[PDB]
């Protein structure tokens, strides 16, 4: 359940692959709710790789469906991220997650 709502520009040809460490300006958003996380604030744009189950499932699928310079809009189902448990005090159980994602990576 990954819905991409693309802010257009970029290249559309250089997709992320396995063995690649990539850099993402993310920004969290709760559906009918406020923010909960922001890479824009810390000024450290979250270096991470693909294929080690580092991030949640709903963020991992949308990262491969982007390219360099693109700006997407993730909409993840509750079951792929936190819906049964809920991250304690931060994410309630059975919650739908909204992300503002832009990929500006290397490799």
From Swiss-Prot:
Task: Tell me one GO molecular function of this protein.
Answer: transmembrane transporter binding
One Gene Ontology term of the biological-process aspect is: T cell proliferation
Enzyme Commission identifier(s) = 5.2.1.8
Domain (PPIase FKBP-type) spans 19-107
The keyword Transport is assigned to this record = no
Question: InterPro entries per the record?
Answer: FKBP-type_PPIase, PPIase_dom_sf, PPIase_FKBP_dom
Q: Which residues cross the membrane?
A: none
Q: Does the keyword Cytoplasm apply?
A: yes
Question: What are the disulphide bonds in this sequence?
Answer: none
Q: Could you tell me what reaction this enzyme catalyses?
A: [protein]-peptidylproline (omega=180) = [protein]-peptidylproline (omega=0)
**Keywords carried by this UniProt record:** Cytoplasm, Isomerase, Rotamase, Sarcoplasmic reticulum
Query: What tissues contain this protein?
Result: Detected in heart muscle (at protein level). Isoform 1 and isoform 2 are ubiquitous with highest levels in brain and thymus.
GO cellular component, alphabetical, reads: calcium channel complex; cytoplasm; membrane; sarcoplasmic reticulum membrane; Z disc
Location of the protein in the cell:
Cytoplasm; Sarcoplasmic reticulum
How activity is regulated? Inhibited by both FK506 and rapamycin.
What is the role of the protein in this entry?
Has the potential to contribute to the immunosuppressive and toxic effects of FK506 and rapamycin. PPIases accelerate the folding of proteins. It catalyzes the cis-trans isomerization of proline imidic peptide bonds in oligopeptides.
How is the subunit organization of this protein annotated in UniProt?
Identified in a complex composed of RYR2, FKBP1B, PKA catalytic subunit, PRKAR2A, AKAP6, and the protein phosphatases PP2A and PP1. Interacts directly with RYR2.
The similarity annotation says: Belongs to the FKBP-type PPIase family. FKBP1 subfamily.
Entry protein name: Peptidyl-prolyl cis-trans isomerase FKBP1B
State the species of origin: Homo sapiens (Human)
């Amino acid at each position: 359940g990954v819905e991409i709502e693309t802010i257009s520009p970029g290249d559309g040809r250089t997709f992320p692959k396995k063995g690649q460490t990539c850099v993402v300006h993310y920004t969290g958003m709760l559906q009918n709710g406020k923010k909960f996380d922001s890479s824009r604030d810390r000024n450290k744009p979250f270096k991470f790789r693909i294929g080690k189950q580092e991030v949640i499932k709903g963020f991992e699928e949308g990262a491969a469906q982007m390219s360099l310079g693109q700006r997407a809009k993730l909409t993840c189902t509750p079951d792929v991220a936190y819906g049964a448990t809920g991250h304690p005090g931060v994410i309630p159980p059975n919650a739908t997650l909204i992300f503002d994602v832009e990929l500006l990576n290397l490799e």
